[PDB]
Structures are given as C-alpha cells and as structure tokens.
Paper text:
In mammals, the canonical Hippo pathway contains a core kinase cascade, formed by STE20-like MST1/2 kinases, Large Tumor Suppressor LATS1/2 kinases, the WW-domain containing scaffold protein Salvador (SAV1) and the adaptor protein MOB1. MST1/2 contain an N-terminal kinase domain and a C-terminal coiled-coil SARAH domain, which are separated by a flexible linker. MST1 and MST2 can each form a constitutive homodimer through the SARAH domain, and kinase activation is achieved by trans-autophosphorylation of the activation loop (T183 for MST1 and T180 for MST2). In this study, using a combination of biochemical, structural, and cell biological experiments, we establish the PP2A complex, STRIPAKSLMAP, as a key negative regulator of Hippo signaling in human cells, and show that SAV1 promotes MST1/2 activation through antagonizing the STRIPAKSLMAP PP2A phosphatase activity.
A proteomic study has shown that MST1/2 interact with a specific PP2A complex called STRIPAK through the N-terminal forkhead associated (FHA) domain of the adaptor protein SLMAP. FHA domains are specific phospho-threonine (pT) binding modules. Like other FHA domains, SLMAP FHA adopts a typical β sandwich fold that consists of two large β sheets. One sheet contains six antiparallel strands: β2, β1, β11, β10, β7, and β8, while the other sheet contains five mixed parallel/antiparallel strands: β4, β3, β5, β6, and β9. The major structural differences between SLMAP FHA and other FHAs with known structures reside in the loops connecting the β strands, especially the long loop between β10 and β11, which forms a short β1’/β2’ hairpin and protrudes away from the FHA core. Despite the differences of the loops at the pT binding site among various FHA domains, the pT-binding residues, R32, S52 and H55, can be structurally overlaid with the corresponding residues from other FHAs, suggesting that the mode of pT recognition is highly conserved among FHA domains.
Residue numbers in the entry: 2 to 139
Amino acid sequence: PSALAIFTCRPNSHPFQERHVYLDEPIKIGRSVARCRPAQNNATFDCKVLSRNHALVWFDHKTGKFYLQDTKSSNGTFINSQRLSRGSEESPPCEILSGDIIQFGVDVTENTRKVTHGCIVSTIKLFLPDGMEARLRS
C-alpha cells in the first residue's frame, strides 16, 4: 500500500504527461534539471516558469490529510487559483483535497521578446494507502 496523487494536465497548462506519484514520503515539485528529470512517478516538469525547488507535496499518514507547500518559488503555487505565498517566500502547509486544481508558476510573456511561456496547471486526484479516494473538494 502507498498513498497516491495523480496529476492530469488541464487545457490551459504547459503540456505534461499524466503522473502517478506515490507519497510514501514527501515529493519535490520543481523544474527539470540535470539528474532530476520528468518521470511518471514524479512531479518534476520541463517548464521554464518553475523553480528548481518549487513546492513539496505529501501525505500525513497519521491524520489521512494531504498537503502542498510552496518552498520559496519565484513565480507562485496555487490551490484553486489561490496563491500560497509571495514570490520567493515559503508558505505554510496547505491541505489539498481530491479534485483540486493545482498550479505551479504563471504564464509569462517575456519583456524582451514576443514569446509566452506556459505554467503547469493540473487536476490532482488523491488516494489513501488502502486505495480509497481521499476527502473530496466541495
């Protein structure tokens, strides 16, 4: 048994393939870098607007709650469009529920050229170690 977060790519997201992220321990969310590349079982994204150490997601095995924390991201982390912390500041742990829309970064139109870079926008579905779906967003 292992708690599980499934990340699926929303229509307004920079593209990524669906992730099946097991949460036996906290998982870093961050930008793809050497030695830390995207994989199905992780929350590492090839996306310009993410920080290397962007956020952290985990399951609290003693209460059955799931959490997301912004770890001083430059461009923001959001739960249902609400920003967890200011730029370059840490948030407290923020509880996430199954069905939340989670966003890392924001779209950025460069100031020096006409290019727009997308951000990661995901639905997250959350499952307890025994397989039952976690508390649902309402």
